[PDB]
Design a protein around this ligand. Structure first.
Ligand SMILES: C[S@@+](CC[C@H](N)C(=O)[O-])C[C@H]1O[C@@H](n2cnc3c(N)ncnc32)[C@H](O)[C@@H]1O
Length: 372
C-alpha cells in the first residue's frame, strides 16, 4: 500500500446502504462483529455500542432507535464519520451510568483482560435496571470466561447465537452494577541514566514495563546522535503509546510530536508527560492523519505494531515506513526497531534507497537517512 491508499476510505455495499472502511480500521470481515450484525435487535429507545469499529455489529439498530457509539480508534472513527453514523471519540468507561436500555459489545479480547473487564463493567453501569446486553466473542479468545464474568455482573444471560467458535449472548441487568475499578496504573523505570514514571490506562502496548525493543532503539539513537543529539530537533514518534520513546526524547530536549491511533494510549501519554514535567504533542491520529500537509521532521522514530509470532509486516507498520520517508527533511534520520523475523530491510531500501543496521540483539534496530 501507498500513502493515499492507506488513508483512503472506501464505501462497501450492504442491503439498504453503504459502510466506509479503510486499512487499519477494525470491524469488517470480522466473524464476531458479523455474528452480532445477524443477532442484534432493538430494545428500548437508547442503545450504546462499546466497541464499534466500522460499525457493522450494531448497524441493525441504526434508524430504529437512538444509537451512541464510543470509539477509541481514530482510523475507525474516520470511517464511522464518513458513514454518517453517530459516534464519539470516547473510552468505553466514559459511558453515562444508567442512561441506556441496550448495549452492544463485541469483546475487545485483543486489548487484554483489563481492557475487556473495564468494558464489561462499563456496560453494566451504562444500562438501566432491566437493560439488555448483547455480548459477542470467540470461544478460543476468552468468550466463556468473560460471558461468565458478565453474568456475575448482571445476572441473567444465555447464548443466543453460534457460528463456528463465535458466540453472541444476551444478558439482562438484574442487579446493581459495581463501581468502576481503578483503571490507572503507573510504574517507574530508568532509561539512559534518567528516571521516569510512566502512567497508563488499560489496553496499552507493553503495560507495566518499558519494552526491551524501545530501550534498544533509544540506546542506538543516543550512540549515533549523542545525548544532546535531539535537542531542539523536531521529532515524530509513530505509534507513541504511553511514551516509552516520547518521554525520553522530550527530556533530551527534542520538540516531539507523537501520533497514536488508540485513545487510551493517547491519554496515557498525556498523563505521563504531565507527571514528568515534560512537554510534547500527544496526538490522537491514524498514522499521520492529524498532521498538516506540510509538516516535516528532522528525526522520526518508531517501534511499529506487530503480530505475535508472525513474519508478515502489518499494513499499519508498512504505512509507518512510507510516512517516515515522506515526512523526513533531506538529511533527516529514521530509527525503527522490530523483531528479527520482520523483513523491513527491503522496504527501507525501496523507500529510502539505502539503510543501515545499528543493532542486532533480541531485536534489531534499523536506520535510514532521507536523501534529497
Ligand atoms: C509496538 S507499540 C509501541 C508503542 C511505544 N512507541 C513504545 O515503544 O512502547 C505500537 C504502537 O502503534 C500504535 N498504533 C497502532 N496502529 C496505529 C495507527 N494506525 N496509527 C498510529 N498509531 C498506531 C499502537 O496502538 C501502539 O501504541
Amino acid at each position: 500500500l501507498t500513502r493515499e491508499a492507506y488513508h483512503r476510505l472506501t464505501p462497501l455495499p450492504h442491503p439498504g446502504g453503504r459502510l466506509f472502511i479503510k486499512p487499519g480500521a477494525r470491524g469488517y470481515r470480522d466473524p464476531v462483529h458479523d455474528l452480532l450484525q445477524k443477532t442484534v435487535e432493538p430494545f428500548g429507545e437508547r442503545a450504546l455500542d462499546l466497541n464499534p469499529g466500522v460499525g457493522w455489529g450494531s448497524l441493525p439498530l441504526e434508524g430504529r432507535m437512538a444509537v451512541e457509539r464510543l470509539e477509541t480508534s481514530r482510523a475507525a472513527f474516520r470511517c464511522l464519520t464518513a458513514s454518517g453514523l453517530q459516534a464519539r471519540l470516547a473510552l468505553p468507561w466514559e459511558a453515562a451510568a444508567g442512561a441506556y436500555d441496550l448495549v452492544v459489545l463485541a469483546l475487545p479480547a485483543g486489548r487484554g483482560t483489563a481492557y475487556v473487564q473495564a468494558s464489561l463493567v462499563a456496560a453494566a453501569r451504562a444500562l438501566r435496571m432491566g437493560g439488555r446486553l448483547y455480548l459477542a466473542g470467540d470461544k478460543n479468545k476468552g468468550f466463556e470466561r468473560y460471558f461468565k464474568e458478565a453474568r456475575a455482573l448482571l445476572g441473567y444471560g444465555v447464548v443466543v447465537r453460534r457460528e463456528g467458535p463465535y458466540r453472541v449472548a444476551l444478558l439482562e441487568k438484574e442487579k446493581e452494577a459495581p463501581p468502576l475499578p481503578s483503571l490507572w496504573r503507573a510504574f517507574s523505570a530508568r532509561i539512559l541514566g534518567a528516571e521516569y514514571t510512566f502512567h497508563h490506562l488499560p489496553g496499552v502496548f507493553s503495560a507495566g514495563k518499558v519494552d526491551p525493543a524501545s530501550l534498544l532503539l533509544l540506546e542506538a539513537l543516543q550512540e549515533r546522535l549523542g545525548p544532546e543529539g535531539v535537542r531542539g530537533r523536531q521529532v515524530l514518534d509513530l505509534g507513541a503509546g504511553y511514551g516509552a520513546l516520547t518521554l525520553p526524547l522530550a527530556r533530551m530536549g527534542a520538540e516531539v510530536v507523537g501520533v497514536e491511533d488508540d485513545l487510551a494510549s493517547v491519554l496515557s501519554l498525556q498523563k505521563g508527560l504531565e507527571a514528568n514535567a515534560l512537554k510534547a504533542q500527544a496526538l490522537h491520529s491514524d498514522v499521520d492523519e492529524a498532521l498538516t500537509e506540510e509538516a516535516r521532521f528532522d528525526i522520526i522514530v518508531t517501534n511499529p505494531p506487530f503480530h505475535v509470532g508472525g513474519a508478515v509486516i502489518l499494513d499499519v507498520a508498512q504505512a509507518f515506513v512510507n510516512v517516515a520517508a515522506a515526512r523526513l527533511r533531506p538529511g533527516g534520520v529514521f530509527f525503527l526497531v522490530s523483531n528479527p523475523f520482520l523483513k523491513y530491510e527491503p522496504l527501507l531500501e525501496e523507500k529510502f534507497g539505502a539503510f543501515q543496521t545499528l543493532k542486532v540483539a533480541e531485536y534489531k534496530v534499523l536506520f535510514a537517512e532521507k536523501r534529497g
